[PDB]
Write a protein that binds this ligand. Structure first.
Ligand SMILES: N[C@@H](Cc1c[nH]c[nH+]1)C(=O)O
Lengths: 215, 218
């Protein structure tokens, strides 16, 4: 089974450089091309360039020729993309893909910003009579005031997935993000089942497991 | 460069029916080897893209038979027969003939389902948040269709402006609905100067607006 494993999310200051990696497994790395793709949040796909890891040869979209440098390390089966002279225009998810686009990396989010990391507060959205109808209750968690993206939310350590809606984050007027995650459950379960939202904000090392109590 | 055009930003389809998604190129994608270097990709919400069709008309390995591609050298169609609710996502064409490779702007597939009014829930600010000096009031519109839904906030029956923010989920891959949150943000001090908090919801599935409210102090 082929896998392309990309490095983790980056928060980097404007005017600096960043290097993202794409480690290949499950096939002979030097026998296939690696392509790089940019995707701004909520937007489409843009092609950056391609490298032949066996030869070192590269071709770049002219739009990225000043911005991007593609290299490959045969000994570690890893392809690299360096982005220089960073600006907020470079904030995006960057993908690697084996030639032709059957096999893709999971993406690397790059946020270019001078703002400081901040961890969120996590507040319960408690189920009440104002969130209970026809035997169904709604409850959730509000994940407020964090930077940068992303936050992940699970419920009951991943055991609860049916009826969960975790909303896209919003950027508040303060420049900090906020999101909520909700779940609908049987109202008859409110007294017998513990509901916990597991919130992770990796950039601030925030991990909160908040129990949401009926009120 | 070769410009790829997808003229429809979205196309709607009822599950079990067929749908066509169009793409055009500003130059023929035909190569002298006889292949036309047009590729179709799907990107599901929160996932990496995945290939569907390679070289215009060939089904990629493991892709369901219901997906097919055809075209001239400059105009192309991805046909999805027997559409399933799980086919929601964005469909992109791409040319792989000449550098720089280029993508179309994408066409979302909207799954048509029965119209459904939202179930509306309202959450006062938590005591924990109030201790920190801020108050967030959350109104949840759950599992509705179509996507268009308007939320207005009224505090002490005064219509609010400028202090709410909404988030909408992507169309659910199982039930084809959307959900929406609206959050009204006030300071604790401003929040305690008022008693009645209400969100008013307008949606095609409703004959008249639905209001959910609470009074501060249970
Ligand atoms: N003929 C292409 C180069 C190419 C070969 N294979 C794929 N692309 C060009 O001029 O950009």
């Amino acid at each position: 089974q082929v896998q392309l494993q990309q490095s983790g999310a980056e928060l980097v200051r404007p005017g600096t450089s960043v290097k993202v990696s794409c480690k290949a497994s499950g096939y002979a790395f030097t026998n296939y091309l690696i392509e790089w793709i940019k995707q701004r949040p909520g937007q489409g796909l843009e092609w950056i360039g391609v490298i032949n890891p066996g030869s070192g040869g590269t071709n770049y979209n002219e739009k990225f020729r000043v911005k991007a440098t593609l290299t490959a390390d045969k000994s570690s089966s890893t392809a690299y993309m360096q982005l220089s002279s960073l600006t907020s225009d470079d904030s995006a998810v960057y993908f690697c893909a084996r030639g032709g686009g059957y096999y893709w990396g999971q993406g690397t989010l790059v946020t270019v910003s001078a703002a400081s990391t901040k961890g969120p507060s996590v507040f319960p959205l408690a189920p009440s009579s104002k969130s209970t109808s026809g035997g169904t209750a709604a409850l959730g968690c509000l994940v407020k005031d964090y930077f940068p993206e992303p936050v992940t939310v699970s419920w009951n350590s991943g055991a609860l997935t049916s009826g969960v809606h975790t909303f896209p984050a919003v950027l508040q007027s303060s420049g900090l993000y906020s999101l909520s995650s909700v779940v609908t459950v049987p109202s008859s379960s409110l007294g017998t089942q513990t509901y916990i939202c597991n919130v992770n904000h990796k950039p601030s090392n925030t991990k909160v497991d908040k129990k949401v109590e009926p009120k | 460069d070769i410009v790829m055009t997808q003229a429809a930003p979205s196309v709607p389809v009822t599950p079990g029916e067929s749908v066509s998604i169009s793409c055009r190129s500003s130059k023929s994608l035909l190569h002298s080897n006889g292949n036309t270097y047009l590729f179709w990709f799907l990107q599901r919400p929160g996932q990496s893209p995945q290939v569907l069709i390679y070289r215009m008309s060939n089904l990629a390995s493991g892709v369901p038979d219901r997906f097919s591609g055809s075209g001239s050298g400059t105009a192309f169609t991805l046909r999805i027969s027997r559409v399933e609710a799980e086919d929601v996502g964005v469909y992109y064409c791409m040319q792989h003939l000449e550098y720089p490779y280029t993508f179309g702007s994408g066409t979302r597939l909207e799954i048509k389902r029965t119209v459904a009014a939202p179930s509306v829930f309202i959450f006062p600010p938590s005591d924990e948040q109030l201790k920190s000096g801020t108050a967030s009031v959350v109104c949840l519109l759950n599992n509705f269709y179509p996507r268009e839904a308007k939320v207005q906030w009224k505090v002490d029956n005064a219509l609010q402006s400028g202090n709410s923010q909404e988030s909408v989920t992507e169309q659910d891959s199982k039930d084809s609905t959307y959900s929406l949150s609206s959050t009204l943000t006030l300071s604790k001090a401003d929040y305690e100067k008022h008693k009645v908090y209400a969100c008013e919801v307008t949606h095609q599935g409703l004959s008249s607006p639905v209001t959910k409210s609470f009074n501060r102090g249970e």
